[PDB]
Amino acid sequence: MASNAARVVATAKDFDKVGLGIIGYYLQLYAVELILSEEDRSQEMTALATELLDTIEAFKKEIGGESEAEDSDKSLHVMNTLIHDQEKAKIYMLNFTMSLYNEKLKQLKDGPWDVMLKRSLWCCIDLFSCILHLWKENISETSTNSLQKRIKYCKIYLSKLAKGEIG
């Protein structure tokens, strides 16, 4: 819901700290789609939507051209190619999104279970549900079945945490 988007904004900043502007651009697009797909809220929500718009323009200008100072041509190729090519954005997400899920499982096993992990599980599923939902038309009904089963496994761990029990 609207609060779900708020958590994404906080997580979006975390990714910027890692230098994953690619995921930031794709996730920001999901944030606006979430607001429009969200139930109508008081004008306060509209004010937050305007601030998000500033982030979009600020996202492209986030560099300010300072990073371009060196190898400016390379910066445009990476920023322009990944931002303009939607397909390039998805494969980049599968590389990080897929690696993030596997590494996340290791954190649950080697790392302690806390409420913060539960919030990350909801966001991880959102990344897969967002990509699959938009590309759902490009996936076969059976191919989707296999991917949907994978989501159940992720949601399964999430449900066990809700009951307080661990696999």
């Binding site: 697009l29 606006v32 429009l36 109508d40 509209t46 939507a49 305007t50 718009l53 979009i56």
Partner: peptide
Amino acid sequence: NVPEIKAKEVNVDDEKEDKLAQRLRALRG
């Protein structure tokens, strides 16, 4: 005072939001 109820949304807000949506669609276009 007036039993009549006004719609929660207003036509003016509808057009302003449409302009904002057009900017986002242009961003992806």
